[PDB]
Amino acid sequence: DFNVKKLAADAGTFLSRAVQFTEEKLGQAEKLDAHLENLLSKAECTKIWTEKIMKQTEVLLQPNPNARIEEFVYEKLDRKAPSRINNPELLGQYMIDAGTEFGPGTAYGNALIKCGETQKRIGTADRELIQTSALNFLTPLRNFIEGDYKTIAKERKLLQNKRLDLDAAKTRLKEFDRQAEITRLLLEGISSTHAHHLRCLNDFVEAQMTYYAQCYQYMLDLQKQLGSFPSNYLSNNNQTSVT
Amino acid sequence: DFNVKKLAADAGTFLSRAVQFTEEKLGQAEKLDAHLENLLSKAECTKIWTEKIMKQTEVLLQPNPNARIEEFVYEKLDRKAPSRINNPELLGQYMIDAGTEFGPGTAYGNALIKCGETQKRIGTADRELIQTSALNFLTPLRNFIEGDYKTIAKERKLLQNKRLDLDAAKTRLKEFDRQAEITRLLLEGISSTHAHHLRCLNDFVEAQMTYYAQCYQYMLDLQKQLGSFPSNYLSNNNQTSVT
Hints:
This is part of a larger assembly, with 2 copies of chain A. Helix content of chain A is 60%, strand content 0%. The first copy, chain A, is an all-alpha fold. In chain A, α6 (112-132) packs antiparallel against α10 and α8 crosses α9 (177-191). The A-B interface holds A 164, 167-168, 171-172 and B 1-2, 4-5, 8. Chains A, B: Belongs to the endophilin family. Chains A, B: Residues 149-174 form a coiled coil. Chains A, B: It is a peripheral membrane protein.
């Protein structure tokens, strides 16, 4: 009865320390009073959070910092680059050829090109889905990464550089005021004036959302375009079908 | 200017952690809520404080736990063991022989045995000083070490033993009440009912104090017993002296 005791005694420490082992892709700022160290740590969480949503919409598997390495490389122009081909275009690309190869004297000939044009028009919607996820969700946050975030990192880097310079200036008894003011104004701008990312998430969920209803209400029309075999080919003299 | 910065940068951590490196001679009790862990830590400080005053009166150098090792060994009976010989007995032991060897036809013959009997009667006072420091200051605290402190350590040892037993009894869902009551009554007895050591320090300072005035007022009598040479041998026809 002592093994299952000692088995839970050194496993509680392993279960308690299972958090601080991963989820790191950048450095850490210099350890300033709690009014400024809390703003600097909140800036570090704001940096890791603003640089950890854009890894999520392009690939479909993002549980790891490999998607953050995929996010750290960035692209501004879309020139000489087409859309990525999706599942519904390829779900109808063969079926067009299968419908013109199978046979026209059969009720599948009024049926396979209906599903083929259905998949080929969900193909343009999924071509739109990769564009509305990359133009209003990937683009302005990336331009804010290479915009004022370099200015914020520059002002806090010169803050942490010249803080030790004024430590040298004040500790010998007998560039930090203006730099700390611009840095603290940038930190209070990215904490208090945070009306930049509520709209980004609230428009990203609408940009994902307004494709699902369109392709659903287009796939509802396939039962109307395909409803002739429970009404006209149901009464066929060759075979009966499902009503 | 960066060396004296880094020199006073890594040295602040060494100056901040210069306390928790020594002053330990026993173990530590098991880490219970703050009402009981604070009483257990107060019991640990009460144990280290009650077992760290008796090291101080016998030896004259106690800055270290070597005096605590000298304090951990304890003695009850004083049988076939005389007093330790002190400085004033040995300050007059030769001077008796020097006075009976030097010469009686000289005013030092009325002077050296006066200082010799002075040092030989400070000798009995310092023989008394080792007894009043070992009988009312060393003895009852040592009898309290091997008295109810073993009972306190036994009740808190069975508390910390059967606390994990009732942890085993309560964590498996679907001897500690009475033991914790006797233990908590002993901890609240050694915190709240602490009218045991005010009298010990208040009598130890009187036991040290009432030797100093006795030997001072006895050494004041040496100027009266030795005042005949500024009055009778001052008017000697051989030589004059100091008045």
